[PDB]
Paper text:
The BRCA2 tumour suppressor protein preserves genomic integrity via interactions with the DNA-strand exchange RAD51 protein in homology-directed repair. The RAD51-binding TR2 motif at the BRCA2 C-terminus is essential for protection and restart of stalled replication forks. Here we used cryo-electron microscopy and structure-guided mutagenesis to elucidate the mechanism of TR2 binding to nucleoprotein filaments of human RAD51. We find that TR2 binds across the protomer interface in the filament, acting as a brace for adjacent RAD51 molecules.
We obtained RAD51 NPF structures on both ss- and dsDNA with bound TR2, which showed clear density attributable to the TR2 peptide. TR2 decorates the outside surface of the filament, binding across adjacent RAD51 protomers. BRCA2 residues 3289 to 3304 could be modelled in the map at the TR2-RAD51 interface, with no appreciable difference in binding mode between filaments on ss- and dsDNA. BRCA2 TR2 adopts a bipartite mode of binding to the RAD51 filament. TR2 residues 3296-KAFQPPR-3302 bind in extended conformation to an exposed groove on the surface of RAD51 ATPase domain that includes the acidic-patch helix. The polar side chains of K3296, Q3299 and R3302 project towards the acidic patch, forming a basic stripe that complements the charge of RAD51 D184 and D187. TR2 amino acids 3289 to 3295 extend beyond the acidic-patch groove and reach the protomer interface, to interact with the adjacent RAD51 molecule in the filament. Residues 3292-PAAQ-3295 fold in a single-turn alpha helix that packs against RAD51’s inter-domain linker sequence, shielding the RAD51 residues that mediate self-association between protomers in the filament. We were unable to detect additional density for TR2 in the vicinity of either ss- or dsDNA, indicating that RAD51-bound TR2 does not engage with DNA within the same filament. Our results provide a rationale for the biochemical observation that BRCA2 TR2 stabilises the RAD51 NPF, as TR2 binding across the protomer interface acts as a molecular brace for the association of juxtaposed protomers in the filament.
Author numbering:
A (entry chain E), B (entry chain F), C (entry chain G): 21 to 274, 283 to 339
D (entry chain P), E (entry chain O), F (entry chain N): 3289 to 3304
Write the structure that this text describes.
Amino acid sequence: GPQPISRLEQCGINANDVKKLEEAGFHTVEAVAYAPKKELINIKGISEAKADKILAEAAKLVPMGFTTATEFHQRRSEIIQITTGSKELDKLLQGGIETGSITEMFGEFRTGKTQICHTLAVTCQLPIDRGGGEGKAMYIDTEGTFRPERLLAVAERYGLSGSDVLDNVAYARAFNTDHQTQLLYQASAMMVESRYALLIVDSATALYRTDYSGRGELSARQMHLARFLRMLLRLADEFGVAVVITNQVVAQVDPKKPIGGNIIAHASTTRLYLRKGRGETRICKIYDSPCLPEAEAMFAINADGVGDAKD
Amino acid sequence: GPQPISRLEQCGINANDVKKLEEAGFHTVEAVAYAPKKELINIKGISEAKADKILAEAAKLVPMGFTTATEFHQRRSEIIQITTGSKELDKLLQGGIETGSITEMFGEFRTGKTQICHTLAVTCQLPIDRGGGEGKAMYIDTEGTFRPERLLAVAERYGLSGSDVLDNVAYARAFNTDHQTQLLYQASAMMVESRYALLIVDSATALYRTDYSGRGELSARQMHLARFLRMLLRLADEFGVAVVITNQVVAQVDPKKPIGGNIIAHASTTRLYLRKGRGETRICKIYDSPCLPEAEAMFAINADGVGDAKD
Amino acid sequence: GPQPISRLEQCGINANDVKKLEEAGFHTVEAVAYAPKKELINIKGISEAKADKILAEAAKLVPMGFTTATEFHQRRSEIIQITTGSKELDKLLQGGIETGSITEMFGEFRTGKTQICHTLAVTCQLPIDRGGGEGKAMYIDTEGTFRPERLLAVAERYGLSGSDVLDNVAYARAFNTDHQTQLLYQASAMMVESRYALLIVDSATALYRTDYSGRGELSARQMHLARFLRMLLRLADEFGVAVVITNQVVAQVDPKKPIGGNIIAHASTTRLYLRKGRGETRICKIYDSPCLPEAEAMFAINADGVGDAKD
Amino acid sequence: FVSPAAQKAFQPPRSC
Amino acid sequence: FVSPAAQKAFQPPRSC
Amino acid sequence: FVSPAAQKAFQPPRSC
Ligand SMILES: Nc1ncnc2c1ncn2[C@@H]1O[C@H](COP(=O)(O)OP(=O)(O)OP(=O)(O)O)[C@@H](O)[C@H]1O
Ligand SMILES: Nc1ncnc2c1ncn2[C@@H]1O[C@H](COP(=O)(O)OP(=O)(O)OP(=O)(O)O)[C@@H](O)[C@H]1O
Ligand SMILES: Nc1ncnc2c1ncn2[C@@H]1O[C@H](COP(=O)(O)OP(=O)(O)OP(=O)(O)O)[C@@H](O)[C@H]1O
Ligand SMILES: [Ca+2]
Ligand SMILES: [Ca+2]
Ligand SMILES: [Ca+2]
Ligand SMILES: [Ca+2]
Ligand SMILES: [Ca+2]
Ligand SMILES: [Ca+2]
């Protein structure tokens, strides 16, 4: 796991500074190591002398140098892939939703974005034997569409204590774009204590369409969104959780591309495009991925969560 | 190859100073020769008297004067051009990715930037007979999208020991813009020992969009990026490797120009603009080059790396 | 031509001093005549007594007094104007690139700055009948983008021995700003022996963006650039060559002004602003000139060098 | 803040 | 730092 | 320094 920031005091850092760091969001040694010198300067009780000391000491505790692809292929083969509750869909993702990375699921309305996030919020607690993550879930919701009764329906499918599953889902309703980012700083604190295995922001860009209106606020909208997506990438490296954000769509009138622009297209590693099939069937499609080939699968929304096409 | 800095002691330089130089990034006689007098002064245990001695002695070991275009056309005709794994694409580049220079590959998401870097990281190890570089690869990755399983898929195509290919790729994950530059100083050390033939920074400008926010930090962003691109150009001259950086894009709302501004447009010698074709086909295009004509080629991403349009 | 400095010994100067002058950059009587008394004092084995003698004797050998505009209009009408390889472009410059003066070509990337310098480096060897300079070329390159294969392509157009043309281009790669200036002292030596007709520094200000970082080094950056541009102006008067420097651009964020500031705007006599036209066409524009009117022309980059819009 | 139950550590979901 | 295998020199990739 | 060919004087480029 990640080393807590308290281990910096044992290396020659004033316990007052650690408190000044922990008031800035940093809670692990990694979070301070990965941080630039610029960020630590922006802290009040920190100067360029301290920041150079903090960065130097923290760098000794976490590897930040070169290795070999062999040593990386080894460490990567032991990465957790959470099942989506669909044999047909996991065969598309070659295992399931991959941890330590940002995954994006966009599509028109009803295409099952929120439904996949509810299934993931349950199956991330199964033992790894059964294809899960053996951890809690963190469901940031910017729409008011978090339904606990949909988590119970999936727990019944996998035979889990519905009362116990709802204890492992830390729910938080974001009301604007500033609050949505504030919830991530509090999120970095919780993941140090417990063991969360899945972070869900649905929808990640819902509140950016309205808080930032026209083109006159376009530049500020993407720069604020870029910091959010960057702060998610930091959580994926600090704790090795799985970040699964959902995205809305927009028509092109010159036939539905996702919003967020190039800021969210480059940041996310895996993009899933969900269409409407027939009846209760849907069609997921590898829109972008570093490793997976471009292909389509057909899942469906059933009364017990996301599952294979029951037909 | 490049002469190691230890050859300065045999010319009247205190072995203590060489240690004070090697603690500043310089590891070859070239790195000290190409360096300005200003940089050596900025070192602590070095004064204007020593620096004038160091520059004078080092200049005797490496040619830094005029020649003729005839002597340069001869020395250039023996330059290595790494194949891209696509006959249609190499015919566009008139040989392949050229060493001793900075090449840039920008485009929207999914356009195969990371995929080309994975193919290059493999084909740079083929013997020159087969169109490679007969050297190791160095893959600095600022996004977390380095997949070793994509290197094995390309090794199977060219019939190479997948276990041996992954031993020649020195991978390093940069977490911010300061760390991204720090990795280049450590990179100059490794290239003295082994024989690297390809340096890959993907993405070179990913972390500059978020570490430096608005326009208020624009000036500092480009000056920090200019030093990075300059430090790459130094590696291309020290060791004659091939620098292949990838770049993200941005929309112009006044229809996708690359980021980085004029700082990265002037610095890079070859720019490749990658579009999305149809299905799995992509369209590369000589955006800028000193010698190559403006033209387009059509490659594709296949299950065995980047290859010709398998259609 | 220019008188060599050896003619000072025949006028009562110690042949030891001439050796002490030639070790300071001066190789012609002009270079010593145009020099201030301050520069000769800065030489070690030279005192105020000698310097007054050296300046007095040298002034007798070269005219440094008043004349008439009639005698100057006569001497100017016999000045050489090198063709740019484009009838449409030469009609803009009213003859071509004018010798005995500093010409600047700035613009965004790909706008054909390096391409014009390659065409000029060839057409400066044509006989004056065909519009050239009947001399060698000197191509100082601070970017690594000197391609001899682009000189051969232009020699084929004008029907010249491609092997002989590459013998008349003295190429030199500058690696920093100190080395860039050092190459000019060695340049003044070569021009005394042979007959160079064109000096090219491309790019003249590329290395000044990175060697001198922020505003804290701004003053030192321009004073170092002012000496360089002044040392070029001296070569244009000593030998009557044609100095053609290229310049990068920078955006103004308050839409692309050239870098270098007022130091390079006043120093250069002719400034050419190169835009991107359509396809392979470009648009040059008299940005500043003492005589030429403000106007635009349209040239293009062809497989045989810079030429008229082949459309 | 943090809930009095969100601060509780993970629990392996018992079967049913 | 440097890996105990990254410091190793280049090896011509054997065929298969 | 100077190349053994850069020190050579100018040559009118012969036709071809
Ligand atoms: N318990 C259930 N059993 C079966 N189908 C259900 C159930 N609950 C919801 N659905 C169906 O799933 C779809 C809703 O999907 P979901 O809530 O994921 O939408 P979404 O993609 O998040 O949409 P939006 O952009 O509006 O938020 C609808 O077709 C709805 O009829
Ligand atoms: N093994 C594979 N076989 C076939 N296609 C693949 C394979 N792996 C990835 N792809 C495809 O290649 C594309 C991904 O390209 P790549 O990873 O180079 O993106 P990129 O240009 O780096 O994007 P970004 O800016 O998001 O990082 C997608 O279309 C994906 O479907
Ligand atoms: N042989 C050729 N035939 C046709 N077009 C060419 C040829 N070589 C280069 N070009 C084109 O000329 C342009 C390159 O111009 P040039 O090398 O002068 O750039 P530049 O202005 O010096 O740029 P930078 O600031 O990046 O150095 C590109 O559009 C390139 O496609
Ligand atoms: Ca929803
Ligand atoms: Ca992406
Ligand atoms: Ca990528
Ligand atoms: Ca360029
Ligand atoms: Ca150029
Ligand atoms: Ca002027």
